[PDB]
From Swiss-Prot, chains A, B:
Homodimer. Keywords: Acetylation, Biological rhythms, Cytokine, Cytoplasm, Glycosyltransferase, Nucleus, Phosphoprotein, Pyridine nucleotide biosynthesis, Secreted, Transferase. Diphosphate binds at R176, H227, R291. The lineage of its organism: Eukaryota, Metazoa, Chordata, Craniata, Vertebrata. Belongs to the NAPRTase family. Inhibited by FK866. FK866 competes for the same binding site as nicotinamide, but due to its very low dissociation rate, it is essentially an irreversible inhibitor. The modification Phosphotyrosine is found at Y168. Its EC number is 2.4.2.12. This is Nicotinamide phosphoribosyltransferase. The keyword Nuclease does not apply.
Length: 461, 461
């Protein structure tokens, strides 16, 4: 990894575009005004990509040769980097201030800020914008996940009276659905800020390496079948597949995909008759978890619950299946369908304790920077020894307006958050800044554990 | 990276669910029936994650410790992996056949197959499904990027009778909008299969390391301004920013974002009057590229085109701006809005040679496995010494039905593609199988250069 090659190309030519005599470039990151976002992921970026000696004679050479060919010109600021190499032993003269990871802050607030600690490197602050803006992913995943947790708590509570098992209603199935091995780990860890159910193993590695927890692992899983593990027996032997797997994993929870050929036939006949004796004998701590994987998410769940209800003993006002029988909808689930499904179940008078959800692509991939409008902007800049407040303000789009001057975040007397502009924070009217330095001159100054982060992101419930 | 930790959690328990006496598991990947996909990206995966000695005593122990806590049970198939370490020195007893990369194949066709080469490793085939499926991303970006090229080619050919400069009509801006550094490079290289304009430097590295090109680099870029490059000067001194920039880059093409305050009160006044002399004086090889970044993409472009048309000399029957002035729409661009904009310009009688497009999130992030239905499935298995064709066929979703038995791809006598199922491919009816062994027993057996891929992915016309 060469940080000199980890930025938008045009940013290579920027050092020649700022106002002469500029000794400071101050920028900030916000989820421009999901009215509530979870701040998570910076630490990962700090350690893995910005910490220590990121500049070397070799890397400078490599960049030089690349850009020379990339621009068909020699715009690369070779001298600017050698400076950092020769004076700071390849460490970035920058200071990043940010809110504690895990913090739930309303939109339109400053989350973190970046500024060069050396006037000569006034061009460095925005050079690292590209790599820093990717924190949108961890923030969005955690937030979107947390909002799904809210939807689940609301309905689980309404239909059962408690939230027993909430931490496991949304299971991560997004490993194969994301765009890369790295994205898998980042996103899966973001999801674990809110839940404990995951099949995206890469998530456990990242958390262990960059954040850490008291317990051995942040998330857990259970044995489960996949289509190949069923179809391999042959269509005529689907029942044999089911019987084998349930017996193999008899003393623990086990999920078996039942839609290989006909999910309904499977629930009514196979599970409800042919193997019924193997199911009802199951412990409450190790139930069978039937798993549909096709057709309309809400219709299939209701139709599957309706059938199992005629084959098994169904019992606050909502119908509950036997403690040894459960269902998991792990197909076509995203924040929107999730809402439709629980509301759809609530209507049909089905308790939510009867179900769990598996979300992959909709949980870790179908997310974008526009969702929370994660943006990095220049608000302050010193030119000719004079500090002026800068900002954009497109005419045809008042939403894209950025904040002005030096920023700071404060806890308001009423216990809320307020972001102050134009250095007004220096006047601690609402107390001291909430943003703390987490990085400075190649050194990670402040770090948080996954346990802290999890605590900070708890729901009000 | 630990391949023993790079799979979906439930796949760790699959070895105990397969039919007993199973010696082989044969699976395939396809983009279930965008009626034409660009196969690209496997080579990156094979070399970086599957090649060589990927199994070691350490990795076995690590994987064992994690899964013991993850499953709260000891289910990890330690004996299975030790066998691989002792028998093949950590090399994966797997063989992967695949259609040449860059190949443009219609959908519903097998793109690559996987199977174990040693009976005791029948479980390995689907253990690596998770990591192999992520190839959906490169395949999708490249395909989406190629379809957009078709659109640009169609309208640029009707408005100017020549595809000159098509290669640079769609610039990659998605570096910051993507979920990770690795995704950025993977996706960027994918886009570069069809174009040469990019700002996502990560892509140049990956191509150089895993594919290689005749030329020094796959993509190129030109100097461009950023909002902070304009606003740093101050609201009142926007014209100064513009002048300084166009001057700094007076001999090379330059892009200047001009919507920081008022896009229209910038093209008519500043660019059309105040600094017009610095513009009409520019070379055809270093024009001024005006860049709006907000408001309706189509409307802003059309309105900006009329302004510039009434301040500069305008000339197949379609309007054209002086060779020293051009426009790039680098906001709100995706496959769909791209079509609309080129369409809108056509109805307004403007030539496409007048504009270029920059796409970020829409290009590399707003995509999922759903788009092309990229799926990995088991089609052939050998149990009790006999091989049977297997597959899924969900009642409620005919679309999710999978192919049966050993597969092969063939070039029809009409220069088309066809997938022969049930090993019927052994019969040289339509020639020889196009799937080539690319990986076997831990070694990459066949590779392609980026030049071959681009060649294989070319468009008709
Ligand atoms: N434990 C499990 O049953 C499990 C885990 C991971 C992925 N998957 C499968 O892959 C899919 C997830 O990917 P998407 O949600 O992105 O389509 C699911 O629909 C499911 O069929 C299943
Ligand atoms: N050369 C360039 O002008 C350039 C390069 C990379 C990113 N960008 C910015 O980032 C945006 C693209 O990212 P998204 O389309 O994903 O929001 C553009 O609208 C632009 O404002 C601009």
């Amino acid at each position: 990894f060469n940080i000199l090659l980890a930025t938008d190309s045009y940013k290579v030519t920027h050092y020649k575009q700022y106002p002469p005599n500029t000794s400071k470039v101050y920028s900030y990151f916000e989820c421009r005004e999901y009215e509530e976002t979870v701040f998570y992921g910076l630490q990962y970026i700090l350690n893995k990509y910005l910490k220590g000696k990121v500049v070397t004679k070799e890397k400078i050479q490599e960049a030089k040769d690349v850009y020379k060919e990339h621009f068909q010109d020699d715009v690369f600021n070779e001298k600017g980097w050698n400076y950092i190499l020769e004076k700071y032993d390849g460490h970035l003269p920058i200071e990043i201030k940010a809110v504690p990871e895990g913090f739930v802050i309303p939109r339109g607030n400053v989350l973190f800020t970046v500024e060069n600690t050396d006037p000569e490197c006034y061009w460095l602050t925005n050079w690292i914008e590209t790599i820093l803006v990717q924190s949108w992913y961890p923030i969005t995943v955690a937030t979107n996940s947390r909002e799904q947790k809210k939807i689940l708590a609301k309905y689980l509570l309404e239909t059962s009276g408690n939230l027993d098992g909430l931490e496991y209603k949304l299971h991560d199935f997004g490993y194969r659905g994301v765009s890369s091995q790295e994205t898998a780990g980042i996103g899966a860890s973001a999801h674990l800020v809110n839940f404990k159910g995951t099949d995206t193993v890469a998530g456990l590695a990242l958390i262990k390496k960059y954040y850490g927890t008291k317990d051995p692992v942040p998330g857990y899983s259970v044995p489960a079948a996949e289509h190949s593990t069923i179809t391999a027996w042959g269509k005529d032997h689907e029942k044999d597949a089911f019987e084998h797997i349930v017996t193999q994993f008899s003393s623990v929870p086990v999920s078996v995909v039942s839609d290989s050929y006909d999910i309904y036939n499977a629930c009514e006949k196979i599970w409800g008759e042919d193997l019924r004796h193997l199911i009802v004998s199951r412990s409450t701590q190790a139930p069978l978890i039937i798993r549909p994987d096709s057709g309309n998410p809400l219709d299939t769940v209701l139709k599957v619950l309706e059938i199992l209800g005629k084959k098994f003993p169904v019992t606050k006002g909502y119908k509950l299946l036997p403690p040894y029988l459960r269902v998991i909808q792990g197909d076509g689930v995203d924040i929107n369908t999730l809402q439709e499904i629980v509301e759809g179940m609530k209507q049909k008078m089905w308790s939510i304790e009867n179900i769990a959800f598996g979300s992959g692509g909709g949980l870790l991939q179908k997310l974008t920077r526009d969702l929370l409008n994660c943006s990095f902007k220049c608000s302050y800049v010193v030119t000719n020894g004079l500090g002026i407040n800068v900002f954009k303000d497109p005419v045809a789009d008042p939403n894209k307006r950025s904040k002005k001057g030096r920023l700071s975040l404060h806890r308001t007397p009423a216990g809320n958050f307020v972001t102050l502009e134009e250095g007004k924070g220096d006047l601690e009217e609402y107390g001291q800044d909430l943003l703390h330095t987490v990085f400075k001159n190649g050194k990670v100054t402040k770090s948080y554990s996954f346990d802290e982060i999890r605590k900070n992101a708890q729901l009000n419930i």
